[PDB]
């Protein structure tokens, strides 16, 4: 029932996205000189070093806050994504399925640690 547990678990979590290889169009902001029409299609980029930027300041309230932001990732890379076999959305789905894997204990132990802080 640690309220604030999330945390660093989050920033575990981030350390492994990190490592793995299908991070690495997603680490840094989409270069705009290399896609010049990015912002034309993307309203809010988002990517892992902001993320984990974000949480550092303690610029995030909760872990579903944190979880809406690397879920813009992967919106984003659909939503850009010329086709659903690219090499980066491809690289995306699976970074995607980890991190749901993961956050959801995350999720779920914050919950039910403002539910006993409730109670
Ligand atoms: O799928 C792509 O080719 C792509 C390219 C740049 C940024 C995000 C993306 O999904």
Redesign the pocket.
């Given at each position: 029932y640690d309220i604030q547990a999330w945390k660093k678990q989050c920033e575990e979590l981030l350390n492994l996205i990190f490592q793995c290889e299908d991070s690495e169009?997603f680490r840094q902001p989409?270069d705009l000189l290399e896609?010049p029409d990015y912002r034309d299609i993307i309203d809010t980029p988002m990517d892992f070093a902001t993320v984990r930027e974000t949480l550092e300041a303690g610029n995030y309230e909760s872990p579903m806050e944190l979880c809406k932001d690397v879920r813009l990732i992967f919106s984003?890379?659909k939503a850009?994504?010329?086709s659903k076999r690219?090499?980066?959305?491809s690289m995306?789905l699976r970074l995607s399925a980890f991190f749901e894997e993961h956050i959801s204990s995350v999720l779920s132990d914050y919950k039910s640690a403002l539910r006993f802080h409730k109670r």
């Open positions: 169009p989409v896609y984003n890379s850009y994504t010329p690219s090499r980066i959305y995306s």
